[PDB]
Amino acid sequence: GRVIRNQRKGAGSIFTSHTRLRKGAAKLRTLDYAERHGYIRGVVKQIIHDPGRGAPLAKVAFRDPYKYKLREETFIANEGVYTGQFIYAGKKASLNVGNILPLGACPEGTIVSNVEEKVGDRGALGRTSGNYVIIIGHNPDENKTRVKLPSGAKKIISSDARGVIGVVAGGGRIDKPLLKAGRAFHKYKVKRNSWPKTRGVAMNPVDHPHGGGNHQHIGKASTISRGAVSGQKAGLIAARRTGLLRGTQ
Amino acid sequence: AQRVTYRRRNPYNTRSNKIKVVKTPGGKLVAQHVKKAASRVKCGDCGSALAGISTLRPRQYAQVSKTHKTVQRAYGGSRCANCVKERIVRAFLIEEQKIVKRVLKEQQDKEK
RNA sequence: GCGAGAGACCGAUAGCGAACAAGUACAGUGAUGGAAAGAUGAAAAGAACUUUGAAAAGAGAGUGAAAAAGUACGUGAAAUUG
RNA sequence: AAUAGGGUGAAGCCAGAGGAAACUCUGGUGGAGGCUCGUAGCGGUUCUGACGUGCAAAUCGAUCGUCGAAUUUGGGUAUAGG
RNA sequence: UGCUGUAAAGCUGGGUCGAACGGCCUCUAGUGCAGAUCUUGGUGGUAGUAGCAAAUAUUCAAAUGAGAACUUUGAAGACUGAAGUGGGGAAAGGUUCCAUGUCAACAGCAGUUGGACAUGGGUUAGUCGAUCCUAAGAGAUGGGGAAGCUCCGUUUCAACGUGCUUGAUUUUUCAGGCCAACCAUCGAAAGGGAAUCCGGUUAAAAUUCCGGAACUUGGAUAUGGAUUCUUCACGGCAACGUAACUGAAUGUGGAGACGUCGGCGUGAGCCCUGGGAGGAGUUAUCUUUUCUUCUUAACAGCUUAUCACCCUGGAAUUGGUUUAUCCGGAGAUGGGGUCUUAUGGCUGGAAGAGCGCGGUAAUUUUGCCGCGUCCGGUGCGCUUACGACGGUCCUUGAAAAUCCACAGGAAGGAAUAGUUUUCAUGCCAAGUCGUACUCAUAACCGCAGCAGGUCUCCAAGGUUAACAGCCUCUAGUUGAUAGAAUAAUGUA
RNA sequence: UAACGAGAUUCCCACUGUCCCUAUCUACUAUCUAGCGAAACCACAGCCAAGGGAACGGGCUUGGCAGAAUCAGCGGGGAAAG
RNA sequence: AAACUUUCAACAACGGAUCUCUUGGUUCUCGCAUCGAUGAAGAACGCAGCGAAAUGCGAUACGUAAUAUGAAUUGCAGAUAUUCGUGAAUCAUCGAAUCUUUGAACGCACAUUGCGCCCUCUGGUAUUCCGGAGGGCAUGCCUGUUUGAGCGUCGUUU
RNA sequence: CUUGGAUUUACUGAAGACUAACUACUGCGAAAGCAUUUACCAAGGACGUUUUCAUUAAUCAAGAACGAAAGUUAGGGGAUC
């Protein structure tokens, strides 16, 4: 047969992300002396739309502690953050929406976003619109914090990892139907080349494991082993179960 | 009516290939190539157009006198009047409160 | 590659693709592909001159051993043709 | 970079009428939409028309689809033979 | 012309021809053709046959010539009908451009003509492009893979400046003061971007030449003005104004710099139209008539605006206000001002130019003279530019070079004199490459002068909703083998 | 299943040369001329009937017959060409 | 009976076989060891009195010098060309030179005749700007020189 | 379901519901309904009144608000039944 559409994406010729209009990478500040020992104050200059992103971004200006210079940061805007607001980041920052605090400095039940998986990676968890991270508890002896991720998973993170207080702005986006193929076209025009999708069952046997037949049908189980190889992993990969989800999981 | 042609090799209606139609002293209708319209100098605080400053294409500011490019005030050609006024009042009031917070702190550094 | 001497070899549809302004003309976007084409006469002596014609040419003449050698050039087969 | 001229008439807004209230009705205004008729354009339904040693190794004529967007298109650029 | 042999063949007469060749005994082989849809070359019948029929359409005369359906000129009849059969360009071609000569071949008839053939001529730039910038991307270096051709990576685990700015020194040595996040390079003749216009001129070039009038950048540099004894100016309540009117490192901003649609407003060009001053046409009759000229560039000065802003004042009986309902104690309405100069007006440029007439010069290079070139109006008009608005998106609609302002306060500054080229005037320079022509029913690609394909700009009158269809003006073509007839069968 | 469809199908109104059943007209061909001038195809060729025969002959056998050179049409045959 | 068709012969066509040639090819043998950063092989563009190509050459351009030789070259023309001679022609020979723009190709770049920087001289009233002439500036590696870096490290002095 | 240690035992944790006993011929609300603590928000009946207004009222076709459980649509939760 032929190389299937799954495998052509790794080469990344026409499958790279369309990034001309993007407004910068959304990251926290580099963890420095001020954030480790006290707090540093910045001011929100802009709240802007980032193409390909549901969450708006905030442009926050900080002073450089060591040279006469202004540093502009690109944060993910939490809902309620406004232009001209003062943003405080550090160990001694107060528990206000938009402030960046270490996870150990936040009491249980604190809603936090753009949380660091590892100390200083500048934000990994809960970055999309309407999403957040809940702080479950602390383990001060081991310097660890328990959090709940938007997927429902419980994670143990260093208490020195940082997060931004509040919920990511732009939530409720999925509640409205797109209603049109053109709307999805414009949605993916600034994301990547993944739309529209032809069904593999509608192809020929060269194109896909599902192609061929005198009727459109998969022919074999569409649940594929985790240990299958590239060109085989088309369908439900390592599916623990199938069918309509009934009851609680 | 007389019809005109472009005066340059560019045949396309691009942003830099805009023309006007002008009648010459020879009684002819010719195309006159129009330079791109200048944009106004704007405030760095509020983004509004600054008054008293000439609207020129950026290289033309080098060849014009200084009175065209500035206003006789602090932040003259950079900030508008209202944004400078707000800076002055904010600087004065905030620094006044800095003294108040200092003397008050010294009041709690000798009795508590 | 350079320099030589040879052959029971081929003799211009052969022998190298190329005996010649041949890796030329020409084709292809490109990698590449790639021909055809030698011979008047010892010597141009390559036909002065007259005449018919708009001219090309023709008819006389002239050169030559030969024009049954005139560059559409040694010989000049067959198909095909008057 | 390009895309006549019409039809329909969504929100929002103005005025009037009715009602105890919750609210309802009418006339305008407005100018929405992968809306619609229809040019340029893009496409290519049918005649199973012409042609079918063609004008053409896919064209010609009428008829037709669509025609403000998942639109059409120049140039630059990327992806290369299991 | 015959003879010999069963035969494969051998020999011979005549003609043609011009330089080598044969018999016999042996040797040797790339050694014998009717075929292989054989190979290469050549030639027939078909056959003077199929055919040379899309794109409305030609005709008379003269000239030229040996020769004219086809060339030239004149007269006419037509068509394209401004989304053109008009006038330019990008790609591509490459001399096809122009003049002269010229007809063997080519232009599927012809040819005196030609994009053919031959000989010459022709492309003029500081301002138009390239050049420079960065885009998607391409790609060296330090490194790391790979047997290697080379692959990855683009500042990457790097000691990465051929650094600058000054006071200089004339001691051709220096003294230092700042920084070195990022930063090789290539990548757009449609993106970004320093600066030019009008009139004239050639057989063929022109935003390039000539005449005149400007502008930008780089450099040098003096005078005037400005400023200083209160050293680095004044005025205005303010918005802010001006001829100027210090400002290092470093920093902050702005411009470059940005979708699309809708109606509205303003301008420009075009369309329409009145008077007057000219010219042409019609005139049996009518028509103070029909057509036409009456124009004004870049650049300089003054003035000119929606929006926005400032001062005054204090608002319900709410008012102002758009086609579109938004605004006002976060200060409306009212009154008075400030600003951007888009755009228009006046003046200079500039009437001296161009245009329209009339009168004269002459084989005549080329003219010379006189007069006029003026004053308006109109709009749901067309196109286009701009403006203030409004709608729209799970879509929010490049970058960089480059230029400016501001913050900062380093350093340097006067009185018998000091400073500055962001005020005026003056001086010098601007290199390299492209530039002709076609851009298509004949200059490109489809084997070709092929009904195909190939990006874009300008756009008159009537009818009309209309940039449709139909007719016409300017411009351009009248090209497509032709003649005679008009059966069948066609095609439309 | 409203709306939509150059999708497939049945019926009805309107409409008509689709038909009964054909006729007439126009232009361009065809046609004839001057000039220009291919190609497919071709063992040899080219009248029938029967016979036998590789069982459907242009040729063979037996008969019918049979008279130069040809033009426009035509599509039975050449088990026509590709 | 003509015409027409077919056959044959003569002459003339069409065409280029046959014959005969041959500065070419092919194969065998013998001898030799010599490309390039001192810039090769290759490419592009030019160069002649009148040349398009081939051949030769490089702005010194169908060639300059030198050695040898000894009267040509030739299609035409023409010497401020030559003949008992420093003398015609000559890739005869060849030891000195020239050798455009390139190319491993070397300042950077190259779909550009694009853009720098350094030294000396020179023109424009110029250490700085503009013009011209000449000479330079690639990378890896080796030896050496100089200038450096690192509490890697030795000695000494508080 | 259980020798792979079930059931049982102690400690710890997480989820959702639900508010026992107190709880009654007791309370509140227009009805449906309402039961852990505290805070906040706005209501309400009765009582008291030598306050106030003076007929403003009763019931009501049309028309409205609320309306157990089950059920429907879309998110979230889904312990127990």
Ligand SMILES: [Mg+2]
């Ligand atoms: Mg899907």
Ligand SMILES: [Mg+2]
């Ligand atoms: Mg699908």
Ligand SMILES: [Mg+2]
């Ligand atoms: Mg299929």
Ligand SMILES: [Mg+2]
């Ligand atoms: Mg398969």
Ligand SMILES: [Mg+2]
């Ligand atoms: Mg399978």
Ligand SMILES: [Mg+2]
């Ligand atoms: Mg299948």
Ligand SMILES: [Mg+2]
């Ligand atoms: Mg299916």
Ligand SMILES: [Mg+2]
């Ligand atoms: Mg000013």
Ligand SMILES: [Mg+2]
């Ligand atoms: Mg030999």
Ligand SMILES: [Mg+2]
């Ligand atoms: Mg040969």
Ligand SMILES: [Mg+2]
């Ligand atoms: Mg050969």
Ligand SMILES: [Mg+2]
């Ligand atoms: Mg011969």
Ligand SMILES: [Mg+2]
């Ligand atoms: Mg004669």
Ligand SMILES: [Mg+2]
């Ligand atoms: Mg002879």
Ligand SMILES: [Mg+2]
């Ligand atoms: Mg002879």
Ligand SMILES: [Mg+2]
């Ligand atoms: Mg001969």
